[PDB]
Design a binder for these strands. Structure first.
Ligand SMILES: Nc1nc2c(ncn2[C@H]2C[C@H](O)[C@@H](COP(=O)(O)OP(=O)(O)OP(=O)(O)O)O2)c(=O)[nH]1
Ligand SMILES: [Ca+2]
Ligand SMILES: [Ca+2]
Ligand SMILES: [Ca+2]
Ligand SMILES: [Ca+2]
Ligand SMILES: [Ca+2]
Ligand SMILES: [Ca+2]
Length: 901
DNA sequence: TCGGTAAGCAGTCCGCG
DNA sequence: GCGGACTGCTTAC
């Protein structure tokens, strides 16, 4: 097989590399890598190395990496550019793996672990590590085993061995319900003292050294705790055995309002799953406790136990250990679904970076571009200092707040990356500038044509047309991968709808789910078999289709994020290729493109309808337009349609056969106007929306920019079995909105769009009457909690104290003195409830850590004093008032002349 | 929260005769 | 009470 790296580090003058050799074996080597850097040289000197602007460079070979670093400093002291890859491990990887990396995940040791630490006096601080580690569960992907290290004797209690037999039993049998599929995979090791546990853990780690190390909160808790505990018990040298190279560094992670410490383990790639989830999931969650996320992702029940976690080991060690094991497994289950580890490996090996570098778009693109240029013997420029400067972004049209009955939307494929490719925007393709007219003049095609030679953006920038820049070249490669995965995602989605349709008529039979590839549209044969399947088999197929769709989503959306990140990186001062001329060339071109096509679409539809000056485009944001289709439907007449699906077909055909070619012609003209390299503005129909045929539903409404709701029948070619609400920006979509209120507001919107005013009024009346029975957690608002200290003045709110922070201060006073009460963590999320006048907490609200029950100390008082009226008005009535006034609807029935009989 | 801009709403403070 | 200046937070792209 082809060799591939696992990890790479620079330690002084050596590269330390762990890798898989040509025989599939894991090896380690220390290499005294001699790096090269570059300086500009005279034109009259034979060289094969040229910078990105075509100027010749001489290669300088250094005796070691320190000499190279020292040369860079001296070049700065002289005032001359020091060119080349200054991150020597990336240059090392580039030299050692000069080919597309083919990796084999089965050879990569991925470890998932979780520790338990009993603590009577509050949260066990990893920096102090003053309490025994009393359980470790460590799953190894090569062995496919859960290694359980269980401490039986501690200063906080001596316990009996954990029983695998009780663990496996149902909770209704007094068991822990450890999933039967992992029972045979558990290797249980009890210990009579912590020193032996830890020594054996280190020996095990030496034998089975993680390459990828993951788990939940491992980077901020488990790793620093284990490292510091071993340090405290045995000394530094022993703790450093967590690194295969015996090198570690305390790394200070700084933010706007403070800092925290993590431990860097040289020769390991830590991918904390909480951080993977935050980066790759495209959710914003009210809580990031593993219980919360596992319930969200997997629909598994919360892990239940009585009493505080600090007493769980002593009271129920059996459950304590089972729950530690289940926690490790839940992360594996989330990864089986989301495939974030697979994604990280794909991206990391593609860029030729340390896998953990996938968190940084700047590092990722720096490596991709370097490798690409090096192929051509080109030499990358030195990174420079730039002051942070704001620059302009997208255009968003101000909509007229209203109901909109029939709507068709259109959206440009991969806009910013397509602009980069079309215009040919790259550091080395800058050709010069032209005299800019106001943007409106380009939008309306009255400005002078910018150039007859170069490719232009309306910000005044011109670009070479003779050859693709490295940025367009490399962005195109990742765009093509994204396109492939999006194809699979959409096929799985369409296949899911086929199964949902079939589920309306399940067969009374015993059978099996079909063995199919859900990434490809079902054949006629498969469709016929599906129509004969039982509900059991269909539901299993639906689950599998949806899992295929999720895998496709992960693969596609994060490649989209990577390419969009390149467009953004051009506007970040830490990027080697930072250039506001290029960043603004992209965004300004986007503004023009949107407004240009709005004009073209309006002109086309005014022509087909025989009107003038009518606004068909009701809204647009960045690269999408929303077109009112009422007049189109009305030209046929609603009475002429057999059913909803009939007019959906008609609009689908109209969009594809009439509007899209008109849109294409419009953009080809704009491409010629800007003299661009290649026409890549591809704007396709996204949504078809409207009320159910014959209903009183309103179909859709806008309240303002970035705030709208649509009843969608077809999205990007997926024809839904049931209409789907597309809701953007409204409170139903915000993590700050109480769970039960999101649900209620969604049902209000559903009724407005699908059923009409009377239906909405019926539901509102009932919600208002019954909502006081809702569980307090479900009606609590949520907020991130920053700068608690700034606003704390002797335990009371200082000037301008935010409402959620006031709530936290209230909570702090109420739990004061109590060492065991859950502390609100700076920067994390809190639930927030308002309090009625005259409550014993002495303020108007209280907040506590999100994803948790409020402590039993104050719960009953919070429940007694909760201000339901304020809750309802703020979270429900106010947003609903916004929706209905925009939609010209009443959520409460107005008096009429009939109220007299 | 270590890892592009536009723009909405909640809330504070305070003016507004 | 509501709007502007401002902070804080959270979306849509
Ligand atoms: N830097 C950055 N830019 C973004 C992000 N999301 C959207 N944008 C910018 C770049 C996009 O090309 C543009 C339009 O966004 P869309 O959501 O329509 O995505 P895009 O057109 O890239 O892909 P698509 O093919 O429509 O899925 O807005 C983001 O997360 N980061
Ligand atoms: Ca735990
Ligand atoms: Ca788009
Ligand atoms: Ca599309
Ligand atoms: Ca059937
Ligand atoms: Ca869009
Ligand atoms: Ca206001």
């Amino acid at each position: 097989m082809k060799e591939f790296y696992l990890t790479v580090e620079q330690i002084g003058d050596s590269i330390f590399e762990r890798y898989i050799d040509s025989n599939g074996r894991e090896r380690t080597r220390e290499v005294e890598y001699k790096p090269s850097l570059f300086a500009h040289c005279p034109e009259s000197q034979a060289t094969k190395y040229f910078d990105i602007y075509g100027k010749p460079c001489t290669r300088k070979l250094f005796a070691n990496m320190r000499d190279a670093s020292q040369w860079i400093k001296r070049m700065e002291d002289i005032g001359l550019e020091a060119l080349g890859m200054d991150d020597f491990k990336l240059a090392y990887l580039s030299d050692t793996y000069n080919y597309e990396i083919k990796y084999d995940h089965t050879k990569i040791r991925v470890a998932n672990f979780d520790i338990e630490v009993t603590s009577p006096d509050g949260f066990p601080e990893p920096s102090q590590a003053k309490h025994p580690i009393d359980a470790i569960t460590h799953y190894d992907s090569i062995d496919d085993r859960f290694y359980v290290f269980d401490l039986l004797n501690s200063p906080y209690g001596n316990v009996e061995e954990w029983s695998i037999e009780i663990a496996a039993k149902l909770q209704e049998q007094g068991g822990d319900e450890v999933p039967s599929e992992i029972i045979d995979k558990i290797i249980y090791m009890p210990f009579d003292n912590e020193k032996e546990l830890l020594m054996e853990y280190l020996n095990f780690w030496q034998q089975k050294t993680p390459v990828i190390l993951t788990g939940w909160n491992v980077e901020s808790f488990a790793i620093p705790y284990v490292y510091n505990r071993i340090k405290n018990i045995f000394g530094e040298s022993t703790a450093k055995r967590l690194s295969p190279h015996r090198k570690t560094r305390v790394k200070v992670i700084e933010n706007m309002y403070g800092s925290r410490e993590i431990i860097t383990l040289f020769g390991i790639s830590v991918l904390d799953y909480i951080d993977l989830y935050k980066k790759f999931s495209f959710t914003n969650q009210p809580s990031y406790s593993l219980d919360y996320i596992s319930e969200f992702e997997l629909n598994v029940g919360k892990l239940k136990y009585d009493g505080p976690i600090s007493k769980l080991r002593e009271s129920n060690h059996q459950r304590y250990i089972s729950y530690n094991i289940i926690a490790v497994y839940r992360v594996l289950q989330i990864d089986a679904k989301r495939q974030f580890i697979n994604l990280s490996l794909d991206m990391g090996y593609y860029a030729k970076i340390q896998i953990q570098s996938v968190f940084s778009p700047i590092k990722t693109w720096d490596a991709i571009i370097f490798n690409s240029l090096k192929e051509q013997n080109k030499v990358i420029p030195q990174g420079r200092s730039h002051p942070v400067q704001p620059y302009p972004g997208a255009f968003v049209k101000e909509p007229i707040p209203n109901r909109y009955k029939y709507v068709m939307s259109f959206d440009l494929t991969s806009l910013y990356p397509s602009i980069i490719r079309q215009v040919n925007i790259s550091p080395e393709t800058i050709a010069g500038t032209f005299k800019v007219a106001p943007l409106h003049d380009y939008i309306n095609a009255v400005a002078e044509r910018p150039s007859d030679v170069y490719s232009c953006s309306p910000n005044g920038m011109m670009y070479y047309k003779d050859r693709d820049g490295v940025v367009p070249t490399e962005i195109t490669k990742v765009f093509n991968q994204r396109k492939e995965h999006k194809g699979y995602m959409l096929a799985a989605q369409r296949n899911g709808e086929i199964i949902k349709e079939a589920l309306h008529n399940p067969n009374l039979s015993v059978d099996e789910p079909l063995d199919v590839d859900y990434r490809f549209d079902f054949s006629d044969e498969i469709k016929e078999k599906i129509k004969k399947l039982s509900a059991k088999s269909l539901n299993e197929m639906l689950f599998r289709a949806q899992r295929t769709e999720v895998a496709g989503m992960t693969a596609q959306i994060n490649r989209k994020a990577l390419i969009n990140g390149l467009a953004g990186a051009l506007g970040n001062v830490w990027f080697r290729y930072y250039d506001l001329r290029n960043a603004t060339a992209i965004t300004t071109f986007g503004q023009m493109a949107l407004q240009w096509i709005e004009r073209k679409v309006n002109e086309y539809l005014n022509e087909v309808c025989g009107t003038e000056g009518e606004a068909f485009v009701l809204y647009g944001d960045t690269d999408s337009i929303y077109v009112s289709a009422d007049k189109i439907i009305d030209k046929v007449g609603e009475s002429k349609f057999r059913d909803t699906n009939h007019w959906v077909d008609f609009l689908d055909k109209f969009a594809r056969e009439r509007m899209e070619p008109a849109i294409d012609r419009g953009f080809r003209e704009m491409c010629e106007y800007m003299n661009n390299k290649q026409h890549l503005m591809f704007m396709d129909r996204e949504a078809i929306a409207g009320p159910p045929l014959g209903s009183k539903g309103i179909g859709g409404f806008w309240t303002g920019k970035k705030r709208y709701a649509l009843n969608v029948w077809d999205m990007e070619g997926t024809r839904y079995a049931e209409p789907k609400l597309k809701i953007m920006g409204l409170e139903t979509q915000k993590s700050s909105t109480p769970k039960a209120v999101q649900k209620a507001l969604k049902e209000c919107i559903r009724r407005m769009l699908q059923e009409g005013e009377e239906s909405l009024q019926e539901y509102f009346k009932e919600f208002e009457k019954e909502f006081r029975q809702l569980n307090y957690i479900s009606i609590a608002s949520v907020s991130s909690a920053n700068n608690i200290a700034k606003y704390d003045v002797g335990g009371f709110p200082g000037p301008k104290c935010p409402f959620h922070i006031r709530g936290i201060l209230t909570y702090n006073r109420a739990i004061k003195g109590n060492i065991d009460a859950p502390q609100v963590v700076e920067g994390e999320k809190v639930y927030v409830l308002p309090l009625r006048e005259g409550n014993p907490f002495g303020d108007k609200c209280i907040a506590w850590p999100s994803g948790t029950e409020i402590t039993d100390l104050i719960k009953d008082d919070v429940l007694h004093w909760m201000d339901y009226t304020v809750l309802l008005e703020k979270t429900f009535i106010k947003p609903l008032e916004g929706f209905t006034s925009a939609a010209k609807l009443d959520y409460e029935k107005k008096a009429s002349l009939f109220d007299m009989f």
